[PDB]
PDB file of C-alpha atoms in Angstrom:
ATOM      1  CA  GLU A  19     204.214 165.036 -90.349  1.00  0.00           C
ATOM      2  CA  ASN A  20     203.672 168.033 -88.057  1.00  0.00           C
ATOM      3  CA  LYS A  21     204.558 166.666 -84.604  1.00  0.00           C
ATOM      4  CA  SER A  22     202.737 169.420 -82.698  1.00  0.00           C
ATOM      5  CA  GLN A  23     199.356 168.238 -84.052  1.00  0.00           C
ATOM      6  CA  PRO A  24     197.206 165.940 -81.900  1.00  0.00           C
ATOM      7  CA  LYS A  25     197.139 162.235 -82.678  1.00  0.00           C
ATOM      8  CA  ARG A  26     194.689 159.401 -82.052  1.00  0.00           C
ATOM      9  CA  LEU A  27     195.924 155.915 -81.295  1.00  0.00           C
ATOM     10  CA  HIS A  28     193.947 152.702 -81.685  1.00  0.00           C
ATOM     11  CA  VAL A  29     194.617 150.453 -78.687  1.00  0.00           C
ATOM     12  CA  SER A  30     193.437 146.871 -78.981  1.00  0.00           C
ATOM     13  CA  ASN A  31     193.436 143.576 -77.138  1.00  0.00           C
ATOM     14  CA  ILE A  32     193.145 145.465 -73.857  1.00  0.00           C
ATOM     15  CA  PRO A  33     191.667 143.737 -70.790  1.00  0.00           C
ATOM     16  CA  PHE A  34     187.863 143.597 -70.989  1.00  0.00           C
ATOM     17  CA  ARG A  35     187.784 145.069 -67.504  1.00  0.00           C
ATOM     18  CA  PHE A  36     189.495 148.310 -68.631  1.00  0.00           C
ATOM     19  CA  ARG A  37     187.567 151.574 -68.480  1.00  0.00           C
ATOM     20  CA  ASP A  38     188.514 155.188 -69.275  1.00  0.00           C
ATOM     21  CA  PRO A  39     190.729 155.789 -66.243  1.00  0.00           C
ATOM     22  CA  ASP A  40     192.684 152.621 -66.949  1.00  0.00           C
ATOM     23  CA  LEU A  41     193.753 153.796 -70.400  1.00  0.00           C
ATOM     24  CA  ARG A  42     194.279 157.324 -69.179  1.00  0.00           C
ATOM     25  CA  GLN A  43     196.602 156.041 -66.456  1.00  0.00           C
ATOM     26  CA  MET A  44     198.553 153.802 -68.818  1.00  0.00           C
ATOM     27  CA  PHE A  45     198.986 156.406 -71.571  1.00  0.00           C
ATOM     28  CA  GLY A  46     199.015 159.529 -69.392  1.00  0.00           C
ATOM     29  CA  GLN A  47     202.691 158.959 -68.560  1.00  0.00           C
ATOM     30  CA  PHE A  48     203.582 159.999 -72.098  1.00  0.00           C
ATOM     31  CA  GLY A  49     201.865 163.373 -72.135  1.00  0.00           C
ATOM     32  CA  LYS A  50     198.600 165.310 -72.180  1.00  0.00           C
ATOM     33  CA  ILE A  51     195.577 163.316 -73.342  1.00  0.00           C
ATOM     34  CA  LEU A  52     192.645 165.092 -75.034  1.00  0.00           C
ATOM     35  CA  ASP A  53     190.323 162.111 -75.153  1.00  0.00           C
ATOM     36  CA  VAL A  54     189.961 158.465 -74.229  1.00  0.00           C
ATOM     37  CA  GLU A  55     187.361 156.148 -75.653  1.00  0.00           C
ATOM     38  CA  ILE A  56     186.695 152.464 -74.972  1.00  0.00           C
ATOM     39  CA  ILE A  57     184.231 150.789 -77.316  1.00  0.00           C
ATOM     40  CA  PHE A  58     181.392 148.569 -76.029  1.00  0.00           C
ATOM     41  CA  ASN A  59     178.481 146.619 -77.348  1.00  0.00           C
ATOM     42  CA  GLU A  60     175.591 145.136 -75.376  1.00  0.00           C
ATOM     43  CA  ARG A  61     177.904 142.277 -74.229  1.00  0.00           C
ATOM     44  CA  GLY A  62     180.161 144.906 -72.632  1.00  0.00           C
ATOM     45  CA  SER A  63     183.645 146.044 -73.600  1.00  0.00           C
ATOM     46  CA  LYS A  64     184.883 145.008 -77.002  1.00  0.00           C
ATOM     47  CA  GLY A  65     188.458 145.147 -75.699  1.00  0.00           C
ATOM     48  CA  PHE A  66     189.688 148.108 -77.695  1.00  0.00           C
ATOM     49  CA  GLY A  67     189.620 151.871 -77.569  1.00  0.00           C
ATOM     50  CA  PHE A  68     191.171 155.094 -78.706  1.00  0.00           C
ATOM     51  CA  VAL A  69     193.542 157.427 -76.954  1.00  0.00           C
ATOM     52  CA  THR A  70     194.018 160.921 -78.333  1.00  0.00           C
ATOM     53  CA  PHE A  71     197.169 162.879 -77.454  1.00  0.00           C
ATOM     54  CA  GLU A  72     197.532 166.645 -77.597  1.00  0.00           C
ATOM     55  CA  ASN A  73     200.734 166.162 -79.636  1.00  0.00           C
ATOM     56  CA  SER A  74     202.024 163.497 -82.000  1.00  0.00           C
ATOM     57  CA  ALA A  75     205.497 163.255 -80.496  1.00  0.00           C
ATOM     58  CA  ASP A  76     204.003 162.065 -77.219  1.00  0.00           C
ATOM     59  CA  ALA A  77     201.688 159.665 -79.098  1.00  0.00           C
ATOM     60  CA  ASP A  78     204.630 158.261 -81.059  1.00  0.00           C
ATOM     61  CA  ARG A  79     206.536 157.623 -77.820  1.00  0.00           C
ATOM     62  CA  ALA A  80     203.539 155.920 -76.223  1.00  0.00           C
ATOM     63  CA  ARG A  81     203.100 153.702 -79.273  1.00  0.00           C
ATOM     64  CA  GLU A  82     206.812 152.807 -79.401  1.00  0.00           C
ATOM     65  CA  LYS A  83     206.825 151.888 -75.722  1.00  0.00           C
ATOM     66  CA  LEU A  84     203.439 150.206 -75.364  1.00  0.00           C
ATOM     67  CA  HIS A  85     202.784 148.406 -78.645  1.00  0.00           C
ATOM     68  CA  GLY A  86     203.170 144.656 -78.114  1.00  0.00           C
ATOM     69  CA  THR A  87     203.394 144.955 -74.334  1.00  0.00           C
ATOM     70  CA  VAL A  88     201.782 142.249 -72.203  1.00  0.00           C
ATOM     71  CA  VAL A  89     199.257 143.683 -69.750  1.00  0.00           C
ATOM     72  CA  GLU A  90     197.237 141.328 -67.522  1.00  0.00           C
ATOM     73  CA  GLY A  91     197.761 138.353 -69.827  1.00  0.00           C
ATOM     74  CA  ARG A  92     197.228 140.175 -73.128  1.00  0.00           C
ATOM     75  CA  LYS A  93     199.643 141.441 -75.754  1.00  0.00           C
ATOM     76  CA  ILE A  94     198.198 144.853 -76.519  1.00  0.00           C
ATOM     77  CA  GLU A  95     198.500 146.501 -79.910  1.00  0.00           C
ATOM     78  CA  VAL A  96     198.895 150.239 -80.357  1.00  0.00           C
ATOM     79  CA  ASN A  97     198.587 151.688 -83.846  1.00  0.00           C
ATOM     80  CA  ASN A  98     197.716 155.023 -85.396  1.00  0.00           C
ATOM     81  CA  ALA A  99     193.928 155.144 -85.719  1.00  0.00           C
ATOM     82  CA  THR A 100     192.249 155.085 -89.129  1.00  0.00           C
ATOM     83  CA  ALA A 101     188.701 155.411 -90.481  1.00  0.00           C
TER      84      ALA A 101
END
């Protein structure tokens, strides 16, 4: 792949309390973020979201470091997003 291109990660099993700044803080360490999205329904957070990096190399590092990491009692999963 072309590592300069942006890349969206799917981040799941995140604490229900998380909001935008919480993901931004956790993933921001790895590089510039273009977008952050947490998904909700009428019962509140669904406990997953998307983080989009300006480049794929940064995204790949974030995924390698954060996938499977336990945060506030939850093993989070970080995967490349799909349709």
